Amino acid sequence: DMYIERAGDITWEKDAEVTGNSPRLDVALDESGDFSLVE
Amino acid sequence: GETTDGVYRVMTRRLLGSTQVGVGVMQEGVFHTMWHVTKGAALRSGEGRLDPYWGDVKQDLVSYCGPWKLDAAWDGLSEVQLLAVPPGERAKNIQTLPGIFKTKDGDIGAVALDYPAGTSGSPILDKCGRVIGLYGNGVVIKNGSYVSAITQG
Numbered sequence: 001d002m003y004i005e006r007a008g009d010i011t012w013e014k015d016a017e018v019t020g021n022s023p024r025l026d027v028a029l030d031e032s033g034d035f036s037l038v039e
Numbered sequence: 040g041e042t043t044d045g046v047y048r049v050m051t052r053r054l055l056g057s058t059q060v061g062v063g064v065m066q067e068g069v070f071h072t073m074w075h076v077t078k079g080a081a082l083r084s085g086e087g088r089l090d091p092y093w094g095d096v097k098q099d100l101v102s103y104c105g106p107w108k109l110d111a112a113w114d115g116l117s118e119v120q121l122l123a124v125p126p127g128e129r130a131k132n133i134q135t136l137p138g139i140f141k142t143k144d145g146d147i148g149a150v151a152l153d154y155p156a157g158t159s160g161s162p163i164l165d166k167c168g169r170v171i172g173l174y175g176n177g178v179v180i181k182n183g184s185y186v187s188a189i190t191q192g
């Protein structure tokens with residue numbers, strides 16, 4: 001049986017570490033909820 | 040059980056030790072997570088039990104105790120924060136400018152941040168602290184990096 005444990009508040013953090021890029025990708029979503037790359 | 044708003048870890052004791060299988064959001068008395076984390080199973084919170092209320096494998100989302108309550112959306116312009124809750128590690132906010140998932144049914148925001156599989160269900164927030172979606176369902180692109188959809192109900 002699965003259980004939940006509190007991990008924190010949901011708040012915006014001022015001056016957080018900014019990382020990650022912003023790619024634009026063509027994707028398809030199948031009936032199983034799996035995303036794949038369209039080529 | 041604990042019904043205070045916030046971010047929570049989804050744990051299991053069926054495997055070796057205590058393993059974190061995902062994360063979710065408690066808001067307005069409803070627990071929100073991704074379908075692939077719990078597979079629609081009931082959850083324990085202290086001495087209480089949370090029963091699934093709504094779910095959909097294709098959206099990859101599930102809510103417990105009531106209907107989906109998160110309705111904020113990415114505005115298409117501003118930076119957002121992944122409130123990442125990794126297995127065995129403290130909750131940490133990471134800021135990013137989302138990319139785009141272009142589909143035949145329209146566009147969806149996407150966050151290019153890599154975390155272990157058990158971080159699935161971690162909320163993505165706007166500047167006002169509102170949850171605009173959950174992290175954890177996406178794709179692995181050309182050079183092995185991970186890109187998650189900003190999945191919202």
Ligand SMILES: Cc1cnc2c(cnn2CC(=O)O)c1
Pocket residue numbers: 153154155156157158159174175179185
């Ligand atoms: C959050 C997340 C979830 N799944 C991921 C990643 C990266 N690769 N995968 C596939 C998997 O491990 O099954 C990140």
